[PDB]
Amino acid sequence: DPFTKTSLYESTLKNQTDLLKVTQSTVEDFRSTNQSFTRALEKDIANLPYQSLITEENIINNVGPILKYYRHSINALNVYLGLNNGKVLLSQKSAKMPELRDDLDIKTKDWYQEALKTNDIFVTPAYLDTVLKQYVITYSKAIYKDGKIIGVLGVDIPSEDLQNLVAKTPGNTFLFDQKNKIFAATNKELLNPSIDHSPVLNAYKLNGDNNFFSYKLNNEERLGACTKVFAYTACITESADIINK
């Protein structure tokens, strides 16, 4: 009876919409927590007197402890300050104090370049950190003291941390990165690189953010929706058995 099928469709749409929104929130809260942390660290570095910032030895001794404590507070992988001479003061997970490194090619990096092109925090796509060889998301920020550039702050957070948060959420939810490659999922099988996601991705392009759609898998009907969340695409799908059976 159409009345009953409509009531089941409306219910499951609501439920699945809610669950999609939980995954969206997870991504938003991960980002904003890292941004706030990065902003706080900027403020504490820029608060230092100029004298503490204008020789490399003073940067080591005065900025280094701040990087280390901040790193520990959030269990970041790397926290660092890159200078215009190409050196970077690096606090890395491993208890030796932070050291100035001249070998990390920092002006070639997008976290460095892009921080100098915006007054905001820059957020990288996930990429393989050169130092610890883990996949990270980097938050970077050009630090200025009274208009004068001190250097570019960077904070590397393992991308696994966001993957793990997403996976824990309820519902059959998943994320794609900017390249429409699968990035995270509640059901770990979706992460197989050989899975074709065109049906979902195509139905999302046709329907738009948060607009619920029908599609087929192995001749069976499924329901889903996606929405953009920053550069990511977040999706949920389920079997259409709830409305058909």
Interface with Na ion (CB under 5 A), residue from 186, 207, 210, 239: 186
Interface with ligand I2M (CB under 6 A), residue from 129, 160, 161, 238: 129
Residue 71 touching Na ion (CB under 5 A)? no
Stretch 95-114 residues interacting with Na ion (CB under 5 A): 109-110
Residue 143 touching ligand I2M (CB under 6 A)? no
Closest distance between Cl ion and the C-beta of residue 76, in Å?
A: 13
- Which amino acid is residue 161, in one-letter code? D
Applying CB under 6 A, which part among 15-23, 123-131, 208-216, 235-243 lies near ligand I2M? 123-131
- What's the per-residue H, E or C state across 101-162? ECCCCHHHCHHHHHHCCCCCCEECCCEECCCCCCEEEEEEEEEEECCEEEEEEEEEEEHHHH
Which of 38, 114, 101, 47 has the alpha carbon at shortest distance from 70?
38
Which of 164, 157, 115 has the alpha carbon at shortest distance from 136?
157
Q: What is the largest CA-CA distance in the chain?
A: 78
Residue 222 touching Cl ion (CB under 5 A)? no
- Residue 222 CA neighbour count, 13 Å, CB half: 15
Residue 87 touching ligand I2M (CB under 6 A)? no
Residue 31 touching Cl ion (CB under 5 A)? yes
Question: Which CB atom, from 104 or from 201, has the smaller least distance to ligand I2M?
Answer: 104
* DSSP-derived 3-state class of residue 221: strand
The H-or-E segment that residue 71 falls in is helix 64-74
Interface with ligand I2M (CB under 6 A), residue from 31, 71, 87, 109: 109
Closest distance between ligand I2M and the C-beta of residue 126, in Å?
A: 11
The residue count for binding Na ion (CB under 5 A) is 6
Applying CB under 6 A, which part among 9-17, 103-111, 219-227, 236-244 lies near ligand I2M? 103-111
167: left (phi over 0), alpha (psi -120 to 50) or beta: alpha
Site residues, ligand I2M (CB under 6 A): 78, 80, 88, 90, 104, 106, 109, 129-131, 136, 138, 154, 156
